[PDB]
């Protein structure tokens, strides 16, 4: 335990995360770079994501918990463009260091941010556009314009046309005709390492690591004679020869009683296969294993089955097939049968393990993007990049207002807060301008990684937005030349920038109020 | 605590040298003329000598993350080519080395360097597609070109001098599969002893087991049955049962009921009309004598991998629940006899009912060649099976990399700007891949490669490098050709993996637990 | 041992006293303290600070023991009790150098507190009449506490929602267990909802999740402790069996025992069925066809709140359910916030409790919010039995501080200096305020001497305008009755610490 | 090749990368912090940098000896000497290993390239000679090329007139001891004064006048400390102190007789090598003669060249030897310590330049600038040929090296072209410190010379291609030949190392 008072724990505590957050600063925007982080277990995770790095990174100062606690709420709120947003989350604490040297009270610094935060949002509401005013066709065209700037962020952005139709067609299957709804829970992306990254397709369903046991039949049967969705079924109770699970004892007083125990399972072997054959269910998933003597009769009756399937994947199958998993053998009925359009096992590599793929060609509740790639490290990075796209469309649904991206929002509200600071006067004039000054570091940081003059671009933005009130002029991240964002189809959700900046401002209010740091062991 | 972090200054230099240091071991393994390496394991004191880095780089501990992704992508190469796949790590190491010299000279931002490799990879796909030749239209030349495709892919191991004896093995075996891409159908057995050229291709199955006591070593016109039922351990139950008896009289009746259990079980087996029986587990003495009384062969101790290969090669089916004798199928072979291959005699099958699979007999001088021939035959017919699916092929052997250099150089003129430096760097690094190949045979990589470079620009596509004579020879005359599907995945994955390694500005080392 | 041991016991309280300096006042800052639960506590009020603070020296537990007494008593602004008691020990250092015994010090502070109990009644005034009352007086008292800790800017929206929740409390009952609430993570910091009944998070997932209806017009509440799953019997499941067909009958009997109880759950027809124990996947697909709300793994405290709300009961037998064991409410609307569904009980037969649903990821925010509700019930209890209030901001102690200087000036010799040290110790409350506000404590305390003498009484200190003004006319007020037990408790604790001349530690 | 030469290539490049920021007029100075004595020195020249840095590679220590050669011959811009040899080691990592060529063949490729490099330097040389009117006026702009490579360049135009008038007073003196450089703390570089005379940091006596006109100055090597030292192994044998007190006192009069011999010269100023006792010092006051003492060795030597006198030990003859005369010897106090300012020398035999600066590190470092600049002025008088610098000379040689590669052809052309590519990396490194585009500036300069324009060059101030004759960039042939011929032969020895032998430390 150390004794820290005064500017010791009121400055270096903020300066700590200031040097830590400057590490990921080089990853801002599509021009950013990746990083290597070795886990304590020895594994290595390579990603540029600000939330993924800070989650598994073990630091010293307790301020790291404040940065992770914010990212926990951001994933459930916005979680869109994490590489872009994570940099501006710490930009509010950098400007507060200059106001402390000037003699402003730390609480007056924190209270001055919330005053200018409500006025900056009102200015952003002027230039926002309503995408919901159009039809469904123009709405999907707005998604294609947004999926270019928004969806593509990290690596694999080389070819963005392969994943463009993946995110667009994913929200088309599950959506309301009035364009108010979201479900991101039934959409799960399970990828594999193989082939090329351009081989990704759209297959709605789940990918099971376990294949069909008893390699004495065909790997996949595409059609079905009974039609009606192949009659998918899942048994909740484990599949075993029936025996009491509770403690019991057997008493054999004669040879005949021992012979009846032989025909005991023999009568149950035929009883279990006939109840399934009577229902005609082709796909029967056993949760825990199966009986060795029944490993044949399933193929004899043409009953493909699998073993050791996780309960999480079983929930997505029943909701996708619109069926109900069978809780009890006596409760087995044709009313609980599911609907499966096509089921097959992917060849994957040479041998390896064949991956069972359940696919529904029609509208289904479980939407999945088929993903294959050569690099193993890009798997978790490319999936989580498209996982945020589920919340991107969600921001366009719940919030019909959309603003032009490219850092043009912070420049637009910069001129408003500068004018609103002169109305209050007092000591808050420099405090309100400081809140807008911290937001002015975002455009200068965007041009840092691209090799463009930070101020030379920022000076043109305020000069151009002075004559015309349109916000389409913004920072050019990828080097497209002219800074008009309307021709480049660069748009960002309104609620995305709203909450992520507001929640960061609300959190920094309590951070600047920290004076003494007391750390005790667990 | 104890977290060592390197900024863009240290991490940029440390990440590039990491792949170059370990990459020097796989540079000499390129091509049929490539060399091998040795690894000393601290556990069991074993070693693996091979030119394929999938089993080399995986067992080499390394603290540089730059080569960690290179090992994971080797499984993709293990699922496609499998032989001579070290060029993926060699070409990636050259891209990291040329980019290291490109940032020290041009001093452009690393993201711009990646944008140059993105436009350079597009020109490489156009040169391979326009040069793709499809001979599948003529079935006569198709079966003959499979030998030329084989001669390229089947030279890896030290035994490649025997390829002329081994070319007939993969030629007739791919014709027997008729579309079987799985290695579980292909029967690969290892035999110690005999000459290196003694390996032959026999039609049938070879079993390493034997007959227990009275089973005749030669059985003709036999019905082969495969059963997963339990024999050796008998009574083992696993019920909730317990045993209570008043006197030893009924105690022996339980053993008498055990005989009646097996007597009624062999009665259902006798209804099958089989002269051959196979079990997954061991066979108890009592049913072993019952097999000899009824004239039924006995085979035991077939593991999970071997129980399938019996029915897959012979076309049979694993049968359980004997209560349905006529609902299943029975395997059949013309001649079932015990032969002697090497020291351990083996059980030979002849005249299988289904020719869907074949058995390749492998005899070699040393144990080092056992796992060495396994790696060469790991992907052998599967490579030929992928040529059955994708029939477009292109001349390989180092010339195809020079043909793509002409397309990249042509595209570099239309691009120009400051991004052409990274585009030209990809062409310069690609031309160094056959240069290292010429360095492995000890021949001239200067004058020969310089002539091959001007020959591609003169409009001669068939020009290539001769490995045996060390001169300029046409690949169509030597018979060196590779499929379009394999080479496309090698060049693309090497460039995609190199884009990630150039993006590392930081290396964080956590304190070990 | 000796005079040095008393100073060692005082120095142990100084480390706690110096840490609680920012913890008092609206403009006071916050302190960061890490505990063994991996919960970082950033708070203003020192209520929960002393509970989670790591105690090193054994004598420091004296301030912790008296804190829990004032925790359920007041709970708001109780950090000044240990600060004032610390000043009494800090100002006792020159007294220890003299020959004044701690018992002579005991009589000095007691006479000041014995009069202070009478002064608080004199300094205050009965309001009642047509003046500030319910929906008004409750808003003025709750705004002082809450807005002085967190949500400084948005307190207009935030406190207004919490004050409206306390309005449901009525007299003639005034139950103290009505303050029970829940913690809802996630959401915006400025967004909050009002709920008049118990809310409980799913905490588990099952295949019938998306098929669960969220809206019931007229549900029926039923509480059952029966766990639904396949498991062994209570004591011994051993069964002696002879025939072979009876073993499958056991499998049927194990099913018939469960399946018959599953039908009894659907036979009742109650649209709300809660299980005190976990719920497995065996009864899921069956009970899901009935489309009745169900929640498992419910805490025992939440089940007792339902019993105290709708008057239900928990029974282990379905055939013994009485007609009154099925409760009804006005409306049932299941809310989902951040992929987490929350049940809502609206219109219970008797419900005086209001469970506030908060938002945000920060866990330390609800610490003072639950404490603000703990102070809100104290305001209601102390506004009924005795009707009176005083000014806010913390200037009330400075009014009686000079009154003690005037009386004790002529009273029995040396006892003037001891009481004058107490009145000097009462100045620490505005002293710590002027330090954290960047003001000048010299000019303000000198003006208070005229403000508490020629300035009559009610004039306080205004932090907003950086001036001295009347908080009573400003309508911002502070509870008067909470200072009676706060000032008297610090005296008995200070007199106990100063009376310990030695400390024994075994082993 | 691999284990034989490993650290000889990368290790030598890493040393050149540290001084890479020091190359060029836009470069910066490196701080040298010694682990002992807790001292420090700030110097651009690699002579001091490479000497004080610990070198584990024996090949790096060889670069110190070749640096000392250019230190005495040139001394300015010596960083590019070791950097040019480092680029030859980088190209040798490929041609010897990758291309698999014997090192001697690579050396032979550089041997034929060194002969072709000398032909390009002589033919491209510009002859400035004969009339000294336009020649001396051109020396103003010619000096500014190598005058300031430092951050002190603000003093260029100021010291340009002082350095030009310095050789004008010498009137053809090639000895660097005839010039006097004075280092004074405080002030600015623009406050440097240049007068005809010498300024000494010592002072006069107590009663010596502050102004004396038409004074005759005479020095000597004698020792006035006290008494007489005589020979070794002496002693005094007397009966009592009556004779001993006379022997010590009489020698004070015997030295006065030697001072009486000084008065026969009629000199108004006397200068002694060693210290002077108070009694012979007061005798100089009675005669009205100034006194100067405390000169170890060069104290009397530097003043002898300015006054043009001669050391007189015997004082016997007031006829022969030499008598120096200065118009005004008046003591002039500059800065803190009082200084002795001499003016109106008998001849132009010597000259003195006074420098003033605020930082002590600027005085010691800028002393090497004027010391090397005067050496260049002496070489332009002897050697009549000059060339053009500023990155242009490397591309002109590259045209001749590439021309010779076409005649040789074969596999040696790879080593000949690598020598040209090594000459292409020097302006890249030269322009690397300015922070401008290498591909843009080099391509415009390299292609312009192939088109027949030899007057172009790299301009790092404006970041474009400009005429070196208009900007005043001129290098003498003696400077250019000494750098190229030494750097070409410097790496020739480093490429001959086939083994590394490490001796056991003492």
């Amino acid at each position: 335990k150390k004794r820290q008072h005064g500017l010791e724990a009121k400055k270096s505590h903020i300066l700590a995360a200031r040097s830590v957050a400057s590490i990921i600063k080089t990853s801002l925007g599509p021009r950013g770079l990746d990083k290597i982080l070795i886990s304590p277990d020895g594994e290595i995770t390579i990603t540029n994501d600000g939330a993924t790095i800070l989650s598994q990174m073990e630091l010293d100062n307790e301020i790291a918990k404040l940065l992770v606690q914010l990212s926990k709420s951001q994933d459930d709120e916005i979680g869109d463009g994490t590489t872009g947003v994570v940099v501006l989350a710490s930009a509010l604490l950098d400007q507060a260091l200059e106001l402390i040297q000037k003699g402003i009270h730390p609480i007056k610094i924190a209270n001055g941010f919330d005053e200018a935060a409500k006025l900056a949002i009102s200015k952003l509401e002027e230039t926002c556009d309503d995408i919901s005013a159009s039809n469904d066709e123009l709405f999907r065209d707005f998604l294609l314009r947004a999926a270019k700037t928004s969806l593509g962020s990290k690596i694999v952005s080389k070819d963005h046309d392969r994943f463009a139709e993946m995110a667009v067609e994913a929200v088309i299957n599950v959506m309301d005709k009035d364009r108010k709804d979201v479900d991101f829970d039934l959409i799960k992306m399970q990828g594999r390492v193989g082939g090329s990254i351009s081989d990704s397709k759209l297959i709605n369903g789940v990918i099971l690591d376990k294949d069909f046991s008893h390699p004495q039949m065909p790997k996949c049967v595409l059609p079905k004679e009974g039609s009606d969705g192949v009659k998918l079924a899942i048994l909740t109770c484990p599949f075993e020869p029936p025996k009491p699970k509770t403690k019991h004892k057997l008493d054999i007083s004669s040879v005949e009683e021992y012979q009846k125990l032989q025909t005991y399972e023999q009568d149950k072997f035929k009883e279990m296969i006939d109840d399934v054959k009577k229902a005609g269910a082709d796909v029967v998933i056993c949760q825990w294993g199966f009986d060795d003597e029944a490993n044949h009769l399933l193929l004899q009756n043409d009953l493909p089955a699998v073993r050791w399937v996780g309960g999480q994947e079983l929930e997505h199958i029943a909701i996708s097939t619109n069926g109900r998993i069978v809780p009890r053998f006596q409760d087995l009925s044709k009313d609980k049968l599911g609907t499966c359009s096509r089921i097959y096992e992917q060849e994957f590599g040479t041998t390896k393990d064949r991956m069972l793929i359940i696919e529904q060609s029609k509208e289904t509740k479980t939407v999945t993007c088929f993903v294959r790639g050569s690099n193993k490290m890009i798997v978790d990075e490319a999936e989580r990049a498209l996982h945020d796209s589920l919340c991107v469309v969600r921001n366009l649904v719940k919030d019909s207002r959309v603003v032009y991206g490219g850092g043009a929002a912070e420049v637009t509200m910069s001129l408003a807060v500068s004018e609103e600071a002169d109305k209050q006067r007092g000591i808050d004039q420099y405090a309100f301008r400081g809140f807008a000054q911290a937001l002015d570091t975002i455009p200068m940081t965007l041009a840092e990684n691209s090799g463009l003059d930070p101020i030379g671009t920022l000076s043109t933005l305020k000069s151009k937005q002075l004559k015309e009130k349109i916000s389409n002029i913004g920072v050019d991240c990828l080097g497209y030349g002219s800074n008009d964002m309307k021709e480049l189809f660069v748009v960002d959700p309104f609620i995305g920038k709203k909450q992520q900046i507001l929640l960061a401002t609300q959190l920094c209010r309590m951070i600047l109020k920290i004076d003494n740091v007391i750390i005790s062991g667990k | 605590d104890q977290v060592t972090e390197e900024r863009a200054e240290n991490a940029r230099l440390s990440a590039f040298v990491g792949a170059i240091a370990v990459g020097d071991l796989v540079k000499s393994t390129l091509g049929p003329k490539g060399m091998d390496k040795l690894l000393q394991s601290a556990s069991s004191n074993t070693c693996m000598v091979t030119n394929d880095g999938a089993t080399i780089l995986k067992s080499i501990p390394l603290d540089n993350p730059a080569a960690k992704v290179l090992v994971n992508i080797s499984k993709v190469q293990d699922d496609e080519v499998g032989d001579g796949t070290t060029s993926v790590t060699v070409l990636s190491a050259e891209l990291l080395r040329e980019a290291e010299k490109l940032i020290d000279q041009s001093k452009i931002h690393p993201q711009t360097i990646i944008e140059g490799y993105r436009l350079a990879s597009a020109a490489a796909l156009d040169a391979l597609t326009k040069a793709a030749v499809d001979n599948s239209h003529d079935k006569t030349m198709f079966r003959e070109d499979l030998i030329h495709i084989a001669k390229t892919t089947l030279s890896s191991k030290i035994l490649s001098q025997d390829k002329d004896h081994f070319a007939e093995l993969a030629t007739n075996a791919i014709l027997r599969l008729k579309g079987s891409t799985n290695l579980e159908h292909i029967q690969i057995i290892k035999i110690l002893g005999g000459k290196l050229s003694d390996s032959f291709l026999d039609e049938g199955f070879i079993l390493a087991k034997k007959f227990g006591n009275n089973q005749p070593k030669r059985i003709e016109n036999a019905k082969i049955l495969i059963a997963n039922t339990t024999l050796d351990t008998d009574k083992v139950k696993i019920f909730g049962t317990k045993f209570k008896v008043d006197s030893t009289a009924k105690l022996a009746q339980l053993e008498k009921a055990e005989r009646e259990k097996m007597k009624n079980k062999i009665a259902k087996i006798s209804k099958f009309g089989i002269n051959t029986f196979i079990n997954r587990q061991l066979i108890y003495d009592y049913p072993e004598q019952l097999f000899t009384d009824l004239g039924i062969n006995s085979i035991e101790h077939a593991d999970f991998e071997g129980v399938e290969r019996l029915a897959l090669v012979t076309g049979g089916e694993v049968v359980s629940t004997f209560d349905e004798p006529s609902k299943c199928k029975l395997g059949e072979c013309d001649v079932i006899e015990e032969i002697m291959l090497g020291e351990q005699p083996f059980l030979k099958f002849s005249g299988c009912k289904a020719g869907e699979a074949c058995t390749i007999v492998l005899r070699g001088a040393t144990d080092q060649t056992l796992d060495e021939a396994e790696r060469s035959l790991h992907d052998a017919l599967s490579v030929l099976s992928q040529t059955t699916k994708e029939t477009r092929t292109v001349l390989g052997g180092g010339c195809a990399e020079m043909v793509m250099s002409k397309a990249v150089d042509t595209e570099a003129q239309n691009i120009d700007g400051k991004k052409s430096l990274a585009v030209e760097a990809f062409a310069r690094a690609l031309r160094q891949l056959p240069t290292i190949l010429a360095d492995n045979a000890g021949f001239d990589s200067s004058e020969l490669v310089s002539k091959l470079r001007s020959s591609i620009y003169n409009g001669i596509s068939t020009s290539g490098l001769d490995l045996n004579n060390g001169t300029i020879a046409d690949m169509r005359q030597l018979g060196i050709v590779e499929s379009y599907k394999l080479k496309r995945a090698v060049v693309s994955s090497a460039s995609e993996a190199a884009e990630v390694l150039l993006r590392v500005d930081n290396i964080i080392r956590a304190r070990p637990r | 041992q000796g005079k040095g041991q008393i100073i060692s016991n005082i120095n142990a309280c100084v480390a706690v006293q110096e840490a609680l300096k920012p913890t008092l006042g609206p403009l006071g800052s916050d302190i960061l303290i890490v505990t063994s639960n991996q919960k970082t506590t950033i708070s203003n009020d020192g209520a929960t600070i002393l509970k989670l603070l790591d105690v090193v020296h054994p004598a420091a537990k004296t301030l912790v023991d008296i804190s829990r007494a004032q925790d359920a008593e007041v709970g708001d602004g109780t950090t000044s009790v240990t600060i004032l008691a610390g000043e009494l020990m800090k100002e006792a250092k020159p007294f220890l150098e003299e020959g004044i015994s701690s018992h002579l010090i005991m009589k000095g502070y007691r006479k000041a507190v014995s009069l202070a109990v009478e002064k608080i009644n004199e300094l205050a005034v009965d309001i009642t009449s047509e003046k500030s009352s319910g929906r008004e007086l409750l808003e003025r008292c709750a705004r002082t506490a809450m807005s002085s800790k967190l949500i400084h800017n948005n307190a207009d929206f935030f406190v207004k929602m919490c004050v409206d929740a306390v309005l449901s409390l009525d007299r003639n009952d005034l139950d103290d267990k009505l303050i029970g609430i829940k913690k809802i993570p996630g959401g915006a910091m400025e967004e909050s909802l009002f709920i008049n009944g118990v809310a409980f998070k799913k905490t588990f997932s099952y295949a019938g999740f998306e098929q669960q209806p969220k809206k019931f017009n007229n549900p029926k509440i039923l509480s059952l402790n029966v766990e639904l799953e396949l498991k062994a019997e209570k004591d011994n499941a051993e069964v002696r069996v002879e025939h072979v067909e009876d073993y499958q009958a056991i499998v049927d009997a194990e099913w018939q025992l469960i399946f018959e109880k599953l039908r009894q759950v659907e036979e009742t027809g109650a649209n709300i069925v809660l299980s005190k124990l976990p719920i497995g996947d065996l009864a899921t697909q069956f009970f899901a066809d009935r489309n009745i709300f169900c929640a498992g793994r419910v805490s025992a405290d939440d089940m007792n709140r339902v019993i105290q709300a709708v008057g239900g009961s928990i029974q282990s037998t379905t055939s013994d359910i009485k007609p009154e064991h099925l409760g009804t409410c006005a409306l049932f609307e299941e809310m989902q916030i951040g992929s987490e569904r929350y049940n809502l009980f609206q219109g219970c037969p008797q419900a005086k409790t209001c469970t506030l649903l908060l938002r945000g990821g920060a866990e330390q925010v609800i610490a003072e919010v639950e404490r603000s509700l703990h102070d809100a019930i104290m305001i209601v209890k102390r506004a009924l039995q005795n009707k009176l209030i005083v000014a806010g901001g913390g200037a009330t102690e400075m009014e009686v501080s000079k009154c003690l200087r005037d009386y004790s000036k002529t009273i029995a010799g040396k006892q003037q200096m001891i009481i004058n040290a107490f009145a000097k110790a009462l100045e620490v409350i505005p002293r710590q305020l002027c330090e954290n506000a960047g003001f000048d404590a010299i000019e303000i305390l000198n003006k208070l001497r005229l403000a508490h003498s020629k300035g009559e009484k009610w004039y306080g200190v205004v932090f907003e305008t950086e001036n001295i003004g009347d908080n009573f006319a400003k309508f911002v007020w502070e509870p008067a009755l909470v200072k009676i037990n706060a000032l008297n408790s610090a005296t008995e604790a200070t007199n106990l610490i100063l009376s310990v001349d030695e400390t024994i530690t075994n082993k």
Side-chain angles (χ1 to χ4, degrees), chain A residues 373-393:
Chain A
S374 64
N375 292 337
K376 183 178 179 180
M377 183 65 73
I378 65 172
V379 175
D380 181 67
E381 183 178 2
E383 292 177 350
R384 294 183 181 276
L386 275 67
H387 295 165
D388 291 344
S389 64
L390 297 176
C391 296
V392 174
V393 177

Side-chain angles (χ1 to χ4, degrees), chain B residues 318-360:
Chain B
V318 177
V319 176
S320 178
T321 303
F322 295 159
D323 291 344
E324 294 177 350
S326 64
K327 302 299 183 181
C328 56
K329 294 177 179 177
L330 296 174
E332 183 178 2
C333 294
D334 290 344
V335 175
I336 295 98
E337 63 184 342
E338 292 178 349
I339 61 172
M340 182 176 284
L341 296 175
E343 182 67 14
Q344 185 64 58
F346 294 159
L347 177 62
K348 182 179 179 180
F349 294 160
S350 178
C352 296
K353 183 178 179 180
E356 294 177 350
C358 55
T359 299
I360 295 170

Side-chain angles (χ1 to χ4, degrees), chain A residues 3 69 105 107 114-115 184 242 246-247 249-250 260 268 325 330 506 513 515-516 518 520 522, chain C residues 18 27 29-30 32 34 36 38 149 153 190 210 237-238 245 247-248 252 254 285 339 361 436:
Chain A
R3 185 177 179 84
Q69 185 64 59
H105 189 278
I107 294 172
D114 290 344
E115 295 300 322
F184 58 89
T246 59
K247 182 178 179 180
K249 294 177 179 177
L250 277 67
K260 292 181 68 66
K268 303 301 182 181
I325 60 174
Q330 294 178 336
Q506 295 299 321
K513 292 166 62 181
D515 289 345
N516 291 336
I518 295 171
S520 178
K522 183 178 179 180
Chain C
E18 294 177 350
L27 295 176
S29 178
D30 291 345
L32 188 147
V34 177
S36 63
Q38 294 178 336
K149 293 187 294 185
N153 191 339
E190 294 178 351
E210 295 84 358
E238 181 179 1
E245 295 84 357
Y247 297 97
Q248 183 62 59
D252 291 344
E254 293 177 351
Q285 295 300 321
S339 295
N436 291 336

Side-chain angles (χ1 to χ4, degrees), chain C residues 52 134 137 145 156 168 215 237 264 286 341 405 425 474 494 501 505:
Chain C
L52 296 175
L137 175 62
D156 291 344
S168 63
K215 183 178 179 180
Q264 294 177 336
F286 178 81
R341 294 182 182 175
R405 293 180 179 85
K474 186 179 179 180
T494 299
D501 59 9
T505 299

Side-chain angles (χ1 to χ4, degrees), chain A residues 1-2 4-5 9 13-14 60-66 510-520, chain C residues 19 22-23 29-35 39-44 49 52-53 364:
Chain A
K1 183 178 179 180
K2 294 177 179 177
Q4 294 177 336
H5 300 290
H13 182 63
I14 304 301
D60 291 344
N61 190 340
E62 295 301 321
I63 189 167
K65 293 184 175 74
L66 296 174
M510 294 177 70
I511 295 171
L512 296 175
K513 292 166 62 181
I514 295 170
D515 289 345
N516 291 336
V517 176
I518 295 171
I519 295 170
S520 178
Chain C
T23 61
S29 178
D30 291 345
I31 185 169
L32 188 147
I33 294 171
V34 177
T35 59
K39 302 299 183 181
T40 299
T41 299
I42 295 171
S43 177
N44 189 340
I49 301 301
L52 296 175
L53 178 63
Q364 70 284 0

Side-chain angles (χ1 to χ4, degrees), chain C residues 160-172:
Chain C
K160 179 62 174 172
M161 295 300 294
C162 296
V163 174
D164 290 344
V166 181
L167 296 176
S168 63
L169 298 175
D170 290 344
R171 65 183 182 276
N172 291 336

Side-chain angles (χ1 to χ4, degrees), chain C residues 193-347:
Chain C
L193 275 67
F194 173 79
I195 296 172
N196 58 32
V198 176
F200 178 77
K201 182 177 76 179
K202 301 302 287 185
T203 63
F204 60 88
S205 179
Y206 60 92
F209 178 80
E210 295 84 358
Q211 295 300 321
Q212 187 173 356
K214 294 176 179 178
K215 183 178 179 180
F216 292 159
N217 290 336
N218 189 340
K220 294 177 179 177
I221 295 171
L222 176 62
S223 296
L224 296 175
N225 62 345
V226 176
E227 182 178 2
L228 297 175
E229 185 66 14
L230 177 63
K231 62 182 178 181
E233 189 66 14
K234 179 62 174 173
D235 291 344
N236 190 30
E238 181 179 1
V239 176
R240 182 178 65 84
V241 177
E242 294 177 351
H243 300 290
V244 176
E245 295 84 357
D246 291 344
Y247 297 97
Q248 183 62 59
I250 294 171
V251 176
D252 291 344
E254 293 177 351
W255 293 355
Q256 185 64 59
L257 177 63
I258 303 301
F259 178 79
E260 183 178 2
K261 294 177 179 177
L262 295 175
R263 296 176 63 185
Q264 294 177 336
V265 175
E266 294 177 351
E267 183 67 14
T268 300
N271 291 337
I272 293 172
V273 176
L274 296 175
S275 178
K276 183 178 179 180
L277 296 175
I279 295 171
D281 290 344
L282 177 63
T284 299
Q285 295 300 321
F286 178 81
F287 180 80
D289 291 344
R290 179 63 180 86
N291 291 283
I292 288 176
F293 177 82
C294 56
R297 294 182 182 175
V298 177
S299 178
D301 291 344
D302 290 344
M303 293 299 294
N304 291 336
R305 294 182 182 175
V306 176
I307 295 171
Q308 295 300 321
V310 297
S313 64
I314 295 171
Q315 295 300 321
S316 63
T317 299
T318 59
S319 64
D320 290 344
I321 294 171
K322 294 176 179 177
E324 71 280 5
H325 295 166
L326 295 174
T328 59
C329 56
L331 178 63
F332 177 81
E333 183 178 2
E334 185 178 3
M335 295 300 294
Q336 185 174 355
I337 303 301
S339 295
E340 294 177 350
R341 294 182 182 175
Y342 298 139
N343 56 33
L344 188 147
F345 296 159
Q346 185 174 355

